[PDB]
From a paper:
The N-terminal four Ig domains of both Sdk1 and Sdk2, and the chimeric construct, Sdk2Ig1–2/Sdk1Ig3–4, are arranged in highly similar horseshoe structures, with pairwise root mean square deviations over aligned Cα atoms (RMSDs) among all protomers of 2.4 Å or less. Two non-overlapping interfaces hold the horseshoe together: a conserved and relatively rigid Ig1:Ig4 interface and a more flexible and varied Ig2:Ig3 interface. These intramolecular interactions bury extensive combined intramolecular surface areas of 2620 Å2 in Sdk1, 2459 Å2 in Sdk2 and 2567 Å2 in the Sdk2Ig1–2/Sdk1Ig3–4 chimera, implying that the horseshoe should be a stable element in all of these molecules. Remarkably, the Sdk2Ig1–2/Sdk1Ig3–4 chimera structure features the same set of hydrogen bonds and hydrophobic interactions that mediate both Ig1:Ig4 and Ig2:Ig3 interfaces. A Sdk2Ig1–2/Sdk1Ig3–4 chimera was well behaved and formed a strong dimer in solution with comparable affinity to Sdk1Ig1–4 and Sdk2Ig1–4. Interestingly the Sdk2Ig1–2/Sdk1Ig3–4 chimera had a dimerization affinity intermediate to that of Sdk1 and Sdk2, suggesting that the Sdk2 Ig1–2 contributions to dimer affinity may be more than Sdk1 Ig1–2 while the Sdk1 Ig3–4 contributions to dimer affinity may be less than Sdk2 Ig3–4, and could therefore both underlie the lower dimer affinity of Sdk1 relative to Sdk2. The crystal structure of this chimera did not show an interaction between Ig3–4 regions in the dimer, although given the variability observed in the conformations of the dimers in the different Sdk1 and Sdk2 crystal structures, the Ig3–4 regions may interact in solution. Sdk2Ig1–2/Sdk1Ig3–4 behaved more like Sdk2 than Sdk1 in the SPR assay: It bound to the Sdk1Ig1–6 surface similarly to Sdk2Ig1–4, and more tightly to the Sdk2Ig1–6 surface than Sdk1Ig1–4 although not to the same level as Sdk2Ig1–4. These results suggest that the majority of the Sdk1/Sdk2 specificity is localized to Ig1–2, but that Ig3–4 may also contribute to specificity.
Sdk1 and Sdk2 are single-pass transmembrane proteins, with extracellular regions composed of 6 N-terminal immunoglobulin (Ig) domains followed by 13 fibronectin type III (FNIII) domains, and a relatively short intracellular domain terminating in a Postsynaptic density/Discs Large/ZO-1 (PDZ) binding motif. Here, we report the crystal structures of cell-cell adhesive homophilic dimers of mouse Sdk1 and Sdk2, each mediated by the four N-terminal Ig domains. These four domains adopt a horseshoe conformation, like many other IgSF cell-cell recognition proteins, but they interact in a unique back-to-back anti-parallel manner not previously observed. Overall, our data suggest a model in which Sdks form cis dimers on isolated cell surfaces, which dissociate to form trans dimers through the same interface when contact is made to a cell surface expressing the cognate Sdk.
Residue numbers in the entry:
A (entry chain A): 2 to 185, 189 to 379
B (entry chain B): 2 to 379
């Protein structure tokens, strides 16, 4: 008949799978028979066209991770599926050997966790001389799993190793140890920021984002780490002895400059301060779409609308029957600065599916039309 | 040491998995040595406490679907994880053989999709004699994939069957046909009263979702003059309608959209009583805390302690307290009383009262939790 390809059911944008499990992707497309399908991984063809609407992997590997989409096609045109990100849960091995490290007495000893490839990033347990060190007033484990020993004393000399656990597959790995030496001290020590918060960008609508600030001082029991936004002492979302600030449901009211302040209570020392900036990445959305079907007349000049917004400002890109217009290099097609597609001297071969994509760092959206050219 | 258990990371609320794949759940707890763990499935123990922070199913079955959570424990107290819903993707076979069905000429043929169990609910396409059946003015396909042929005629008789495709494991199935017979009766010149052949049901929807849809399909003769209209509080709705007025979609519903909706079918220019059906739409606002306790609390012996916990939501969330992963109803401690606001009220504080107090607020739309560790000193 005369039904162009469309999708009855659309894939989830992101999905996490375990290595060794089976993955079945589906091209849930409808249209006039016969329908043909082919699959793309990271925008590279995996298969030729076929009647097979599925892409199966019996046993997933780290390497299978990335972006998947199908192309459905019949005699009327071709259409890209919304892409889906397969994220494969995996844990490599620790890639570093034994290290030796020294810190001055009273100073913070910073021991980075040895490098390890893992999705997602793992949680860690640090050990001092074979014994678990939970976080405390004097022990900080950063969001990047670094062990910060504040106000180091002689007994802090020892061996430190880290055990990492992937929370999706349960793998655990054990690092090579770090030997820490402490060098020689009764005097108080002004607050210094040892791990500063960094600038942070997060996709709009997310559940939470956490800022972290770790300071040294002595006596550490009188060290006080607090967060200010616009000079306002932040009172909720605090934990980890003041070192972590969780912003829940970050919106524009939460963007901007946060400040962490470290004071040594009761002292005349100057407080230590560090700034950090939070930005919201807003995924793209269309502010204008074409009709699903457009009738055009030969020699007529056509304008197919497509407008998008997003933060950062999205890039718009057109496809005709799953071929990008840049590749077609059709001298009668022109993309306008608003995103709309301008066709002149409309011809019968212009009929087919024109599909618009808008995307930035935060996601991708698509819309499409079938153009019919008669007479 | 002196670190009570808490969770470094909390599991995803819902997760889909394929039958035959490996499931690994984790109890990502922090706390002083020694941490032990145990696991629950639909609030029933699967294991005793052990050093195993993992729960693993080598090959999933449908029956492994449900809610899972761990309890973590050290010498200081015990803490309940936020629960997760494991959904198993599968598709059974069709549970019915060949069916035969009879309608009289001009009556509506309501043909249910043949029963098949599957998660998620499959994509269902209707077919007749090798050809695909599209919705039209006369042909409706309900939200439950029921096929409705309004005002049947002789060409409507035939063999109808569905293709069901599961979009998570990609398995396809084809049912055995329903053979529809159109019987002739000697009054096809006379008009038929409007009748609702597929009624709208009650519907519950979590607030703030983008849209929920009610559906009401009616028959009459001449079906040309049939009118389906939607009314709320006696006033005919003029927007939010689609699919020839058979579908009413409420977009971003709030408490203001709760209540009863009536669909009404008339035969224009007739004096027939209109067919009416009621549907009840409930907007569920999931629970959220408006008050939470401090993460750690130091009380004096003999003190009367008020631990806060307050929640808001529609319906009003019910609050339940645990001490060290034991519900207070099982403890039956006469010094523990839960205030109507939801707060926990402890009188004559005792050294054994020390531990983790965990407050749960839940309704039909979800469950939320907060907790504290209580120290009792002299
Ligand atoms: C749809 O919901 C209404 C209420 O939300 C249900 O009707 C109630 O049924 C209980 C049962 O005893 C009665 O006590 C109430 O008085 C009824 N209320 C009303 C307004 O009728 C109704 O049964 C539900 N119907 C379906 C099909 O779920
Ligand atoms: C950690 O992994 C090793 C293999 O790398 C395994 O033998 C051991 O059982 C695991 N332990 C835990 C607590 O998961
Ligand atoms: C963080 O952002 C500010 C302004 O937005 C910039 O000046 C500063 O250099 C950034 N910090 C970095 C890049 O470390
Ligand atoms: C809901 As899933 C397929 O990311 O486990």
């Amino acid at each position: 008949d005369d039904v162009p390809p469309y999708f009855k059911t659309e894939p989830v944008r992101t999905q996490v799978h375990l290595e060794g499990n089976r993955l079945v992707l589906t091209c849930m497309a409808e249209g006039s028979w016969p329908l043909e399908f082919k699959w793309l991984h990271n925008n590279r063809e995996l298969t030729r066209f076929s009647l097979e609407y599925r892409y199966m992997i019996t046993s997933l590997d780290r390497t299978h991770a990335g972006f998947y989409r199908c192309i459905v096609r019949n005699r009327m045109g071709a259409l890209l599926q919304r892409q889906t990100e397969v994220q494969v849960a995996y844990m490599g091995s620790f890639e570093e050997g034994e290290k030796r490290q020294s810190v001055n007495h009273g100073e913070a000893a910073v021991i980075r966790a040895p490098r390890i490839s893992s999705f997602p990033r793992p949680q860690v347990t640090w050990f001092r001389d074979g014994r678990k060190i939970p976080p405390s007033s004097r022990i900080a484990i950063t969001l990047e799993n670094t062990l910060v020993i504040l106000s180091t004393v002689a007994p802090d000399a020892g061996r430190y190793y880290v055990q990492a656990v992937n929370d999706k597959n349960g793998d655990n790995k054990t690092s090579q140890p770090i030997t820490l030496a402490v060098e020689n001290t009764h005097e108080a020590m002004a607050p210094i920021i040892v791990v500063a918060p960094g600038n942070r960008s997060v996709v709009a609508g997310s559940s939470e984002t956490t800022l972290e600030c770790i300071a040294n001082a002595r006596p550490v029991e009188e060290l006080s780490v607090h967060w200010k936004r616009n000079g306002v002492r932040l009172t909720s979302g605090l934990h980890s002895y003041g070192r972590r600030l969780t912003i829940t449901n970050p919106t524009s009211a939460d963007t901007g400059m946060y400040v962490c302040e470290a004071t040594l209570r009761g002292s005349t020392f100057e407080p230590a301060r560090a700034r950090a900036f939070l930005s919201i990445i807003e995924p793209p959305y269309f502010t204008a779409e074409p009709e699903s079907r457009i009738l055009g007349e030969v020699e007529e000049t056509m304008d197919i609308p497509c407008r998008a917004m997003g933060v950062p400002l999205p890039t718009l890109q057109w496809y005709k029957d799953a071929v990008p217009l840049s590749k077609l290099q059709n001298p009668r097609y022109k993309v306008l600065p608003s995103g709309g597609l301008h066709i002149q001297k409309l011809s019968p071969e212009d009929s087919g599916i024109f599909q618009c994509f808008a995307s930035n760092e935060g996601g991708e959206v698509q819309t499409h039309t079938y153009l019919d050219v008669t007479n």
